[PDB]
């Protein structure tokens, strides 16, 4: 089943040997996801899931080598016998070709039927375990699917797509929003399908189209500006899905190096170009263990925002959140609040819907914890500045503005009284001398002939442009406005 130009690259005995398989498979026209997944799942298993070495399995072997830092003597790596990997591969392929026969699916010249795609979906879906928790670590790979029958929400879609490549259908691809996954197929790849569940609720819309979610202007579907993958991007996804987590507090060094390396590989080949989030992931990784001759983290977060704007109508939230993070951690309040504000700038043109709970929570953390904590910390650092910069106060306001605009036209109310207390308290963190140097102008003249300035877009935030800039912050009042 495997081609010989692949076989030869085995066996793999180090992180580097793995990279070779990826650099090499990535230079073909049709990179084998099933193969790459399996290798990745296999490695990730003995490295993160079951680190104790079996001494009674003469087929499984490990490979010694000097340990990275002065700490330690020898580290062991799971040798990927061609035999083991090829056996899994075959087993997967059998399941598929043997549970679906293309005999009855006439494909007019390189297209797949909606019945065929929904079938391959079902094949994989019914192949899934009955007894497991859908949020657990290390069930993303097909290694997982084939070995344990366990696969996580995103993993299922990846699986369906790998399955199709196995059947030869080369028009089916992974669709990736920031919090979901589905499939795109047809000529020019404009036809879509739901293949996996979303969120805690096993509520699926399998066989249905995304059209309805894009329509309702929810963030799950990114107003139609979601990623449409190609084999090369899908390989990126896979590399991003590598979970180096041994424990809630422990991480596998080798799995980190491996995932960091493989991302660069993908970067040099330019395949990260349309994947903002992957650029972020690479960023964060570097911050912790930089590699020589490579760009700074900060450089990368931006390459990420660049990508967002260019290829996705700047409609993606995470590339700001990623950057906001970096500063917040690196105690750079100014730059942090800026980026959080840029975030709300995107969110404002959406609607908060049922399935958007993930992002709701991500703002709620910023609004009600992370921010009131950088501020608290700032009120103590001057007493022993930025807490006295108006532009920072505008950043905060603009942030709240976006969040108010979001709420507008939405099914569920975003704001409730609990948001208020931390608004009131964050304002109060700024001296009235400062909260007044900010020009809250609506607009002089439009168009053009031939302190800092701030214009509100939310009717809510507009109605308070005065209360925010008082010398005494009217608690009781701001509350009753913010909620309505």
């Amino acid at each position: 089943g495997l081609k010989a130009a692949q076989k030869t690259l085995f066996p793999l005995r180090s992180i580097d040997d793995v990279v070779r398989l990826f650099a090499a498979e990535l230079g073909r026209e049709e990179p084998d996801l099933v193969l790459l997944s399996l290798v990745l799942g296999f490695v990730e298993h003995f490295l993160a899931v079951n680190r104790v070495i079996p001494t009674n399995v003469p087929e499984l072997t490990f490979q010694p080598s000097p340990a990275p830092d002065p700490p330690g003597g020898l580290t062991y790596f799971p040798v990927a016998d061609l035999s083991i990997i090829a056996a899994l591969y075959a087993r997967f392929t059998a399941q598929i070709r043997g549970a679906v026969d293309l005999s009855l699916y006439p494909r007019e010249g390189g297209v797949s039927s909606r019945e065929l795609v929904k079938k391959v979906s079902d094949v994989i879906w019914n192949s899934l375990s009955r007894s497991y928790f859908k949020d657990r670590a290390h069930i993303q790979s097909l290694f997982s699917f084939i070995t344990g029958t366990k696969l996580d929400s995103s993993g299922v879609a990846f699986a369906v797509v790998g399955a199709c490549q196995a059947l030869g259908l080369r028009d089916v691809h992974l669709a990736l929003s920031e919090d979901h996954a589905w499939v795109v197929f047809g000529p020019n790849g404009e036809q879509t399908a739901e293949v996996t569940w979303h969120g805690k609720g096993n509520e699926d819309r399998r066989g249905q189209t995304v059209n309805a979610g894009v329509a309702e202007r929810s963030w799950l579907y990114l107003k139609g500006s979601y990623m449409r993958c190609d084999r090369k991007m899908e390989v990126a996804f896979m590399v991003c899905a590598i979970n180096p987590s041994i424990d809630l507090h422990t991480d596998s060094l080798e799995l980190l190096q491996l995932q960091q390396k493989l991302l660069w590989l993908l970067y040099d080949l330019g395949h990260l170009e349309r994947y903002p989030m992957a650029l972020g992931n690479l960023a964060d990784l570097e911050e912790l263990e930089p590699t020589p001759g490579r760009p700074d983290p900060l450089t990368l977060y931006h390459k990420g925002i660049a990508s967002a704007k260019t290829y996705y109508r700047d409609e993606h939230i995470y590339p700001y959140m990623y950057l906001a993070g970096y500063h917040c951690r690196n105690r750079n309040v100014r730059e942090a609040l800026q980026a959080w504000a840029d975030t709300a700038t995107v969110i404002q043109d959406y609607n908060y819907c049922r399935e958007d709970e993930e992002i709701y929570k991500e703002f709620f953390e910023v609004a009600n914890d992370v921010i009131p904590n950088l501020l608290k910390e700032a009120a103590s650092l001057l007493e022993a500045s930025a807490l006295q910069d108006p532009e920072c106060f505008a950043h905060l306001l603009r942030f709240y503005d976006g969040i108010c605009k979001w709420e507008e036209g939405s099914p569920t109310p975003v704001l409730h009284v609990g948001w208020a207390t931390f608004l009131v308290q964050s304002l109060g963190r700024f001296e009235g001398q400062v909260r007044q140097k900010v020009r809250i102008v609506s607009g002089t003249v439009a168009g053009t002939a031939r302190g800092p300035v701030l214009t509100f877009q939310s009717e809510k935030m507009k109605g308070m442009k005065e209360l925010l800039v008082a010398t005494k912050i009217n608690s009781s009042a701001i509350k009753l406005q913010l909620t309505a």
Binding site: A137, D179, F237, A241, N243, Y275, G280, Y318, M321
Partner: peptide, 8 residues
Amino acid sequence: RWXFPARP
């Protein structure tokens, strides 16, 4: 344990 892949 599990994030959406590449989440921040």
